[PDB]
Write a protein that binds this ligand. Sequence first.
Ligand SMILES: CCCCCCCC/C=C/CCCCCCCC(=O)OC[C@H](COP(=O)(O)OCCN)OC(=O)CCCCCCC/C=C/CCCCCCCC
Ligand SMILES: CCCCCCCCCCCCCCCC(=O)OC[C@H](COP(=O)(O)O)OC(=O)CCCCCCCCCCCCCCC
Ligand SMILES: CCCCCCCCCCCCCCCC(=O)OC[C@H](COP(=O)(O)O)OC(=O)CCCCCCCCCCCCCCC
Ligand SMILES: [Zn+2]
Lengths: 141, 230, 141, 75, 62, 62, 226, 147, 107
Amino acid sequence: KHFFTDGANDYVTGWENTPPLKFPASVMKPCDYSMTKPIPKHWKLRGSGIHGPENTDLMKLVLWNRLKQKRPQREVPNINYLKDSIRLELSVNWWLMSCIFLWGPWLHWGQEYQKVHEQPPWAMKRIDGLRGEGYFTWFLE
Amino acid sequence: FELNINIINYNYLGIIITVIISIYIYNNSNIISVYNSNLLLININIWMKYNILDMLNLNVLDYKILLWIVVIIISNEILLFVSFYWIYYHNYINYYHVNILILNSYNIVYNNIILLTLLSTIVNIKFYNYILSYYKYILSYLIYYNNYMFNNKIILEYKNNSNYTNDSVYMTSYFYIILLHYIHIYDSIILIVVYNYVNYKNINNYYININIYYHLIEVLYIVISILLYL
Amino acid sequence: QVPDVFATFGWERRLTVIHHPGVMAISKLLDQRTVVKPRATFNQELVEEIGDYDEDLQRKAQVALDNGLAIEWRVLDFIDDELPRLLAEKREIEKAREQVMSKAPGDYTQPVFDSSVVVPTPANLGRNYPTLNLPSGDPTE
Amino acid sequence: YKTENPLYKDDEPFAKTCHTFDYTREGTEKNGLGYYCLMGLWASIFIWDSLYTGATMPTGVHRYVWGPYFPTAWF
Amino acid sequence: RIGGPPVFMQFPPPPPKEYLADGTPKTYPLHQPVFDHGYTWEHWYMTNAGVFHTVYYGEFAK
Amino acid sequence: PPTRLSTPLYSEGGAFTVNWWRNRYGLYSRRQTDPMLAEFLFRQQVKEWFYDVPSYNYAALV
Amino acid sequence: YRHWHRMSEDDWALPLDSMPEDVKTLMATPQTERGFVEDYWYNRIRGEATLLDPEALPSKSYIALARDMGLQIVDEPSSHMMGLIELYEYLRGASFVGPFGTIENPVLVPAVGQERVVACTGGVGDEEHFTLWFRCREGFMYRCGECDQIFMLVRLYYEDRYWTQTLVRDTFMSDGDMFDLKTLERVHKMWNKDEMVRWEVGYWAQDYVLGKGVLPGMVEEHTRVN
Amino acid sequence: AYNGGYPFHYVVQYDDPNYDCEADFEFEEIPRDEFGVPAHIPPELSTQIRHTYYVPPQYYPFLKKLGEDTPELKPYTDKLIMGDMTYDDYEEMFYKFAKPLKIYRSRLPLPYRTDEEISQEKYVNWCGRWYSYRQRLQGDYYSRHYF
Amino acid sequence: IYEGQTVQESELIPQEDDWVIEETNFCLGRNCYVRFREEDDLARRALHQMDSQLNKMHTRLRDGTVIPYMSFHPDEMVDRPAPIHTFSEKPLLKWTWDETYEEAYDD
Ligand SMILES: CCCCCCCC/C=C/CCCCCCCC(=O)OC[C@H](COP(=O)(O)OCCN)OC(=O)CCCCCCC/C=C/CCCCCCCC
Ligand SMILES: CCCCCCCCCCCCCCCC(=O)OC[C@H](COP(=O)(O)O)OC(=O)CCCCCCCCCCCCCCC
Ligand SMILES: CCCCCCCCCCCCCCCC(=O)OC[C@H](COP(=O)(O)O)OC(=O)CCCCCCCCCCCCCCC
Ligand SMILES: [Zn+2]
């Protein structure tokens, strides 16, 4: 996508909130400890307890988000992604084709008809005696 | 540990640019105004250099900040055109029955729409290459040819038009809307003349800005064509 | 007993984590691109697809596949001449792998093999391969 | 070994976490039948308004078998 | 970030104090006048000093 | 309004729901950098703006 | 971190043209006296010299192996400092959310100076109150006037310096046996022979020990045009 | 899943030892990737080909020692010895053995408080609860009076 | 709406029958215009101003904890008058939640 979005289309830094799905959960998992079981009372708080790099998952997320920036080969995206990347480009190109091979031919026919019959082929011939081509978009009359 | 932001403490371009603006008002010669415009260009370019040199701070939020500024600016460009469309339609009740010759709906609209579409395709190819870390030299010169033809066609139209600005508010609105589009076309030339391949690639705000602006101008011409020619 | 170590990444902006000393040693060893080399293994399906882009590589890749060789791409360009050495190299690597794997725990003696045919090794540091990116055909024929 | 061409693999799913993205129930992925019914009606109104230009000026004369209070006398 | 604008820096010590030749401390301009008149009233006002504190602010006639 | 991230939030299906809002709230956000933090900030905003009774009066007026 | 921009090329490795030309003195300099560039190339030369000698690795202890590669064996003192450093850096561009602070376990507020502005939002749910900002100065156990949440300032200060990865490495790492240049030469001949250089860093390093320009092709390597 | 799959940084190799992509303007040299794949073989095809790291056999005894001292590390070292470790396998090994830095609260110096003051902690907490009780009740009382 | 922290009756039970509410004065003191000495130069008058900041003051309770000068907004947290560079170390807004992870604890 063209526009940059911190959450989804973050191409400036390449940050990703979660690790790749390819990695086993034992190797790397999304940072989610909402399901942690209640802490036993005899356990004592050693660390700060503050959300941050003391948590293993968050640490691995930061580490991977920096070490993923160098890779031996490309991670080929599927054709669906590639189509979306240039959706506007392809659509504009087809619009140009339509303007040349659809709009072009009937516009030429209308002008040639206008030459002989004074008004385009999609207009009501007048009887008022006024001269000239008149309107072109008949449905906006 | 470093500070989150590398504060800029002093700047002197602002004084110069503001004085340059005053010269436009406090002058007795139109030649002074021409040379003053060059001074403006120079100092606006210095400000752009300051933006490029701010890259040394390695601040992630800089791209986002500039991108959103462009969004606001584009919005202001769209709303200025809206004001002209408003001026045009307010007097719609006095159009089409006056003894003036309005524009044809066959020649100008088609060649212009076909031309501006090709301009979009070139910019789109530039974006595609930008994505692929590639460059094609001929692309920019195709833009120059397109701009040349656009300028050649608009000049002849105005010179061969048989109705003047003082003939009717219809004619005034037609000329003004077309001129406003042309000015935005010329601003596109101002931006595109510096297009080159930079190796920092997608952290360069220039590329996204050009793509957005060119699309805006072409889309704006679709609205104009429907209102005036068709 | 394996001590923990600090592993830091980045030059100006440095991120520090805890890591395994052996895992870090392997990581730096694999960074010696001239010593530790990636090698390609083919299958018949992929060899056929190569011909769609380089006919010569398809023929050479077929030879590597037929002999079950894990081969570097640069060597693959000279497989016609290197084949006898590559077959000898395959045997020696297999012998060494077997010897080290079968050895009892705590036995870290070097394997007995002919290193003169294994590249890159001190005994055979390789050949200066000439570039083959030279046209040899006359366009007017 | 066997492999899959990456160009024809399926899109990766959103990660399942406390913060999960789900578009399945929105129904905003593509234009539905209703949208195409709007297009059909637009085409129909466009053709009808031009073919039958006296429809907006109907005739007040009405017979209506079974009188006016029968259901087929309201359409 | 190594070699970037420091988050915190300690103030350097102030420049040496200046005495007059006779040893009198050199005084510097000060815009806190002691106005001359016969009024000596002192008005005190309880003032907001945040959320949980106050300060007894006094205004002196002089 | 739940206070534990383990307890899910109910969402209807459609184009204006809790799930629809979650997908788009953090699109431009630099602060929602991981699931735990993203959900906490999302629920913080939802609690503050959508569980505020008087806010619904303005929805009617607009 | 999310607030950092994209890795530079230097973040992975340094160009060999940044290697100090006086290698003999570089390998004899104490760690406390080595700069960033000097320390990078001391570790790389010594670390790759041991890693490119396979026959000696199995008999080398992890303590000795870590020293050669320049990796610091972790301990509670250094772990504490490094951890608080990384927590400070994370909080530069991340939210500050954690458990409710009490006398037993105050909210830890890392700072380099003697003060940091902090806001208390209270507890969770209905116990959350409006932001109450206060200046957290060192040496005082702060108590919110509203929810009684206890706060405390933690200073990253050591011997007239703040805590950095470089400071932690200098204070706790101990230089081992002086690096022997014979090992550099021995490994150099192992992987570099007959115009094949499979240890480029050791070919450049040996050239400098020889005086710069001695080894084949090195004069041509050092001759630049601009 | 970032930047369209294009790595921000990647290795390129050239067959000619004196080749310079900036000085030369020839049109015959074909660049290779980090694994050595020529550029004319598309990514979709080369990424399917299986590439494994080959270390010199003199390293096998060292890789064996690592596996024995850390049994959890043995399966990865065995793959490396047998030439079955791909880049993905290496990444899994790397992130599996990364641990977070630990902070010890017992090492934090505390703000100075006398032993007399430390014995009054329960009293101060007691005062705080009564202040919150009186605050909450007054809110109801005042709301009723003024409204 | 916010109505204070919730209190359980058990927490309102004293450990002595003589406990009453501590009568500590939260008026910081008597103040006026900061009065600079003539002898002090610009540098030493800056030090004087920095030592007269009300937002650096607090009240110490009977147990040794101090309730600081607090404000609803961070505008009252900078030195008065405002220095050129104020928030060099990013002010930390502390949020509270019930989530926890095992790594923080030790058995
Ligand atoms: C057994 C089944 C057989 C079916 C056979 C189907 C045959 C269909 C043939 C369709 C022919 C259409 C021809 C259209 C010609 C238009 C020419 C024209 O107008 O040229 C000029 C015009 C521009 O004129 P201006 O002067 O600028 O004026 C307008 C703008 N101011 O140029 C254009 O429009 C350019 C585009 C031309 C398009 C030509 C299209 C030709 C299509 C052929 C289709 C053949 C299909 C065969 C199917 C066979 C199946 C067995
Ligand atoms: C600022 C001005 C903007 C431009 C002008 C705005 C005009 C008003 C807003 C229109 C916006 C439409 C956007 C497109 C939405 C869309 O396609 O929305 C599509 C939806 C269907 O959604 P799906 O795609 O999910 O099926 O269409 C419908 O809900 C209608 C289905 C077809 C109904 C056919 C029969 C209709 C009968 C109508 C009778 C009317 C009688 C009136 C008597 C007085
Ligand atoms: C910001 C908070 C906003 C809250 C919402 C405010 C809505 C206020 C609506 C008031 C409508 C009153 C007039 C009704 C029309 C009338 O008397 O109108 C009177 C006329 C003529 O009546 P008679 O001919 O019988 O005298 O009625 C008609 O001809 C038909 C009227 C149909 C009305 C349908 C459209 C309105 C539907 C409103 C639904 C919600 C009502 C809510 C009420 C509180
Ligand atoms: Zn509080």
